[PDB]
């Protein structure tokens, strides 16, 4: 048996296109007023982000529709995403170590996966 859980999660940036018409994207972001990164904290089962099958908790949102979000505040990133239109092109990059700082009792294992105790 060949388990996915054993192999490394790619750390390279990826392009994800979410086609959502006029509904929510189906995920939550965490960030700071400082601009220390915008990260996916939660993906809604059955929502557009989930249906893409290409985003996960711990992804940093680098940009939306060409708009650089690496140094965005949580609020301005929210605005950008809500107003991104029906077709939303996200560049994301898996950053579990940076993400783990936000969530209590969380850490990264050898596979690169986020674990909460």
């Amino acid at each position: 048996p060949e388990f996915l859980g054993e192999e490394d999660i790619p750390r390279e940036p990826r392009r994800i296109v979410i086609h959502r018409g006029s509904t929510g994207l189906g995920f939550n972001i965490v960030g700071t007023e400082d601009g220390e990164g915008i990260f996916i904290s939660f993906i809604l089962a059955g929502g557009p982000a989930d249906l893409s099958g290409e985003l996960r908790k711990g992804d940093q949102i680098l940009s939306v529709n060409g708009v650089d979000l690496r140094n965005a505040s949580h609020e301005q990133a929210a605005i950008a995403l809500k107003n991104a239109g029906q077709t939303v092109t996200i560049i994301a990059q898996y950053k579990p170590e940076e993400y783990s700082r936000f969530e209590a009792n969380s850490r990264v294992d050898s596979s690169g996966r986020i674990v909460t105790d």
């Binding site: 929510g24 400082d34 949580h74």
Partner: peptide, 7 residues
């Protein structure tokens, strides 16, 4: 510094 938003 922290906040969380649904989108």
């Amino acid at each position: 510094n922290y906040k969380q938003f649904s989108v």
